[PDB]
Curated annotation (Swiss-Prot), chain A:
<dbReference type="GO" id="GO:0015986">
    <property type="term" value="P:proton motive force-driven ATP synthesis"/>
</dbReference>
<keyword id="KW-0999">Mitochondrion inner membrane</keyword>
<keyword id="KW-0496">Mitochondrion</keyword>
<comment type="similarity">
    <text>Belongs to the ATPase epsilon chain family.</text>
</comment>
<keyword id="KW-0406">Ion transport</keyword>
UniProtKB/Swiss-Prot annotation, chain C:
<protein>
    <recommendedName>
        <fullName>ATP synthase protein 8</fullName>
    </recommendedName>
</protein>
<feature type="transmembrane region" description="Helical">
    <location>
        <begin position="13"/>
        <end position="32"/>
    </location>
</feature>
<dbReference type="GO" id="GO:0015078">
    <property type="term" value="F:proton transmembrane transporter activity"/>
</dbReference>
<keyword id="KW-0375">Hydrogen ion transport</keyword>
<keyword id="KW-0496">Mitochondrion</keyword>
From Swiss-Prot, chain E:
<comment type="similarity">
    <text>Belongs to the eukaryotic ATPase epsilon family.</text>
</comment>
<keyword id="KW-0496">Mitochondrion</keyword>
<keyword id="KW-0406">Ion transport</keyword>
<dbReference type="GO" id="GO:0046933">
    <property type="term" value="F:proton-transporting ATP synthase activity, rotational mechanism"/>
</dbReference>
<keyword id="KW-0139">CF(1)</keyword>
Swiss-Prot record, chain F:
<dbReference type="GO" id="GO:0005739">
    <property type="term" value="C:mitochondrion"/>
</dbReference>
<comment type="similarity">
    <text>Belongs to the ATPase j subunit family.</text>
</comment>
<dbReference type="GO" id="GO:0015078">
    <property type="term" value="F:proton transmembrane transporter activity"/>
</dbReference>
<dbReference type="GO" id="GO:0015986">
    <property type="term" value="P:proton motive force-driven ATP synthesis"/>
</dbReference>
<dbReference type="GO" id="GO:0065003">
    <property type="term" value="P:protein-containing complex assembly"/>
</dbReference>
Length: 120, 224, 48, 75, 48, 37, 75, 74, 75, 75, 73, 74, 74, 75, 75
């Protein structure tokens, strides 16, 4: 079972195969899995129910396989196609931001986010 | 004539046929056979743009393509079970390797002066062992000279020699008493497994040639 | 091994370097640009 | 000649030692395959060709030992 | 940069494509003043 | 079927060809030496 | 003669050393299987075919070694 | 004489082969323990896997052993 | 006489080499025991009989080496 | 003379042992490739050139070894 | 005479090789002990008996090699 | 005769030294591949360090090889 | 003099045994550094534990060394 | 004379074995350098001089071995 | 004697093999140092002295092997 809930939505809140991108690379959960807690990095996420696959762009969060086979995914915001050009313009602004100043870290996250979006 | 000359002609004739009757007079849609030579084009395009990428990357793209295709065909022709191995005349493959290696060394010296040997200072280190790190970098630099040739050479030589010696053993295994002839097919199957592996490792070695003498050419074309 | 040693090395090498120069010209001028025709044509149909 | 022939048969055995490394080698590649597939549940389409490449290359090093072994043993 | 701040900036970036609803844009707007206090005494209020 | 477009970067392959000539000459001497004991 | 007969028995022994490598290899593949299946308890149906493949290939290097041992033993 | 000597030497050499098998058995058992501690609950699935792995690891050792004996006795 | 007796002593010495692998093996099982028990605090009752089993099997390979050593020494 | 020829063939056998190292090495590079890819699917295109580069360089030591074997055998 | 006494000495030298395995073995046990204890902070009282047991068994293998050396001497 | 034999035997034994260098080289490249997959972006810093590491590991293997040639030819 | 030759040969072989202990010593100390870096705080308990292992690993090598001296003297 | 000269050459060859450990040694240090630097992105200024120290020290044992090899060979 | 002087040179060569173990050992300590420092960022003040201690005894095991080599070699 998968429970995917966000502070403004409830998505998948069983689910056949789920692929999640975590600070440990990528983790896939199918049935029982070891009941770890792993922090989700800014991500492209796929959730598959049967063979049907739905693709989510996930802002990072935390993932926890519960020892009862409940995949708790919580993250700040997301479908993938909806996120998708103007942001590519925005990264140019963000590059400028790296130059001036906390803003560096912010802009670094922005570089990660454009890169991740360009990746898909 | 010379056996070597006759098989070089056979290689030339194999290579011609792949671009003169494989295709349907250059049909845009693409023929099943012509799809093969498209994929070869793309994987060396995308490989040699990746290796010797830079302003010039396509200027040595024909050379890396005919170094692919020569070895790619010569590791199929040399594996026919009654054929004269051009490649297992190691001296031609090794001579070709030394030629490309010297033609990199000369190209590098010409393009990047006598400060070409600054390539063999790879990293900042205290100055009294900067020259040391040139000696035991250059030693390895012309170990690449013989590695590139001997890699391919060993692969081809080992395949034919392995198969023929085991073939000779299994011939005499089936030439003795028939109860050993029964349950004597399993060593033949071992030669079959080796032959399956030898075709695979020959195409893999041909790709490895062309990436490595792209890597040496990367060094020669772009100093560091 | 005598099957890997002829003394005909320079003979071999003559026919060998001839095949290399032949294939180099042959690919470069003939067979490589006829693949590039397929590509450029495909892209021209794509534009129109 | 008896000395040289005995030297061959001993030397053949010596060459056989080289195979041991390849045996461990095959395993190292397959261990990675199993581990990786366990990580993703899904990487396997990408990784399985990589495993085949890996098997062939490791095995090839093994064959070099085998051909030297047979050069002494038979040859 | 706290862990949740790290996620926060990422979320803000994600609202950038332009097809997005007003409520999304509203969730990115904020208005607050962290007014520090001590002892009684009040060090000055300043926007988040 | 076939078409011809000259690729003029055969003069960029001048050190490769030069190396071929040197090794060709050297192999003449090597062949003569191997045909001797 | 005595030298040749000795050489067969010596060379056989030397060959046997090689087999040790394959043994370690086999274990490594199984180790990956156990750990892998532990990490995702439903990976087993995919992974178990892969595991048997890895076993067989690792074992094969051992087989070639043991063949050379028997060739020296009886030749 | 020399031929009989060669039997005793040959046997000795073969004994070296056993070292690998010893390491092998252990590697499988290490994985069993690691696996059990890792899942708490894989144990019923993993136990038949472990037995299989033990047997195969051991088998390579057995081949080394029989060659050792074979050179000694005959 | 002298040669055969000499050979027996040498062969016994060679046989000890086999033991080295069993030593490393035992350690590997025990390391796993320590690591597992430290990971769970609670697996220990299940894991301890497994550990004893693994010890015995690993040890047993070394035992095989020992009996062969005695056989060569004594003849 | 027979001693020289004997020694040549013995020496050949001895050199072959070196190859085992390269076989394990080749496997180690491929193990890294499989693990890296599984840990990040998007890395794959950057990593694949580096992997082949590493394979060759690893292999090269084995080819040096093999060349000594061939120097003894053919020479 | 000479050959047999020589052979005994040679055999003894060879016997040391078995000990190397034990040396590594002991280290692996102790490394594990340190790792476990550093991971848990508190496993140590349960683990320390286990560690001693593992040490002894590893050492015992080395002892077997050593006594065979002594027998040849 | 015996001296000629000895240099050939010694050449064989010396070749074994290469074994370690092959493992060494692979460990450097392995760490490179692992590192780049871990960071996504370390590679610019790490790649010079990796080439340095390759050279030093390889150099040890070349020491083995030159000793082999000093025996064999010399 | 064959016996005297044999003493010297045996001694050389005896050094091989020491190699394992040398690696072993480092492995224990590696664990120490790892543990200490993980906790910052385990260190006061662990440093004694480490020293116990350090000595023990060394002792195996001492046995090998002792056999070398026993051979050398006879 | 012949035996003594032979013993120099044989002794040198045997000595060359030791060098291998130092080769592996350099790699173990460099692996840690790469791994550490990949973990932090920023440890590197401390870690790089530590690594060069580690290289030199690991190498030193190898160099002692190389000295003995030369002493046997030339001396 | 010829045999005795030979045995000194040969025996020395064998003695040199021991150095390999120390080389790998030293590298492991420095690897752990780099790993630890990269793990903590800041442990180093305590840990660097510890690393020198671990280095020292690992090195010492090598020096013992070396000293046996010197004794045989020099006489």
């Amino acid at each position: 079972k998968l429970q995917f809930a966000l502070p403004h939505e409830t998505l998948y809140s069983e689910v056949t195969q789920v692929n999640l991108p975590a600070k440990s690379g990528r983790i896939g959960v199918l049935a029982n899995h070891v009941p770890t807690v792993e922090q989700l990095l800014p991500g492209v996420v796929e959730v598959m129910e049967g063979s049907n696959s739905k693709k989510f762009f996930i802002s990072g969060g935390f993932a926890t396989v519960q020892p009862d086979s409940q995949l708790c995914v919580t993250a700040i915001e997301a479908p993938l196609e909806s996120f998708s050009e103007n942001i590519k313009n925005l990264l140019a602004e963000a590059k400028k931001n790296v130059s001036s100043s906390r803003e560096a870290a912010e802009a670094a996250i922005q570089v990660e986010v454009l890169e991740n979006l360009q990746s898909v | 004539l010379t056996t070597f000359s006759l098989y070089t002609i056979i290689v030339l004739l194999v290579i011609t046929s792949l671009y003169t009757l494989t295709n349907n007079n250059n049909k845009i849609i693409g023929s099943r056979w012509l799809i093969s030579q498209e994929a070869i084009y793309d994987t060396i395009m995308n490989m040699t743009k990746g290796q010797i990428g830079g302003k010039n990357w396509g200027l040595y793209f024909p050379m890396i393509f005919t170094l692919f295709m020569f070895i790619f065909i010569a590791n199929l022709i040399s594996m026919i079970p009654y054929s004269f191995a051009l490649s297992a005349h190691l001296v031609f493959i090794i001579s070709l390797s030394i030629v490309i290696w010297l033609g990199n060394t000369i190209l590098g010296l010409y393009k990047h002066g006598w400060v070409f040997f600054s390539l063999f200072v790879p990293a900042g280190t205290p100055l009294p062992l900067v020259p040391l790190l040139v000696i035991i970098e250059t030693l390895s630099y012309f170990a690449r000279a013989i590695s590139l040739g001997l890699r391919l050479g060993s692969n081809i030589l080992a395949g034919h020699l392995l198969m023929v010696i085991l073939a000779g053993l299994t011939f005499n295994f089936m030439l003795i008493n028939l109860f050993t002839l029964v349950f004597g097919f399993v060593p033949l199957a071992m030669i079959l497994a080796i032959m399956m592996l030898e075709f695979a490792i020959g195409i893999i070695q041909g790709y490895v040639w062309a990436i490595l003498t792209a890597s040496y050419l990367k060094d020669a074309v772009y100093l560091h | 091994m005598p099957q890997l040693v002829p003394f005909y090395f320079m003979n071999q090498l003559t026919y060998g370097f001839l095949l290399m120069i032949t294939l180099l010209i042959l690919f470069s001028q003939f067979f490589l640009p006829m693949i590039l025709r397929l590509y450029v044509s495909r892209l021209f149909i794509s534009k129109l | 000649m008896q000395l040289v022939l005995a030297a061959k048969y001993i030397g053949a055995g010596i060459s056989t030692i080289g195979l041991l490394g390849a045996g461990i080698g095959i395993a190292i590649v397959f261990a990675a395959l199993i581990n990786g597939v366990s990580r993703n549940p899904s990487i396997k389409d990408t990784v399985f060709p990589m495993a085949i490449l890996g098997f062939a290359l490791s095995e090839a090093t093994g064959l070099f030992c085998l051909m030297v072994s047979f050069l002494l043993l038979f040859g | 940069i706290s862990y949740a701040a790290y996620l926060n900036v990422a979320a803000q970036a994600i609202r950038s494509t332009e097809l997005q609803t007003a409520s999304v844009l509203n969730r990115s707007q904020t208005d607050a003043f962290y007014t520090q206090y001590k002892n009684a005494s009040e060090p000055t209020p300043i926007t988040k | 079927m076939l078409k011809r477009f000259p690729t003029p970067i055969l003069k960029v392959y001048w050190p490769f060809f030069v190396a071929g000539a040197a090794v060709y000459y050297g192999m003449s001497k090597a062949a003569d030496l191997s045909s001797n004991t």
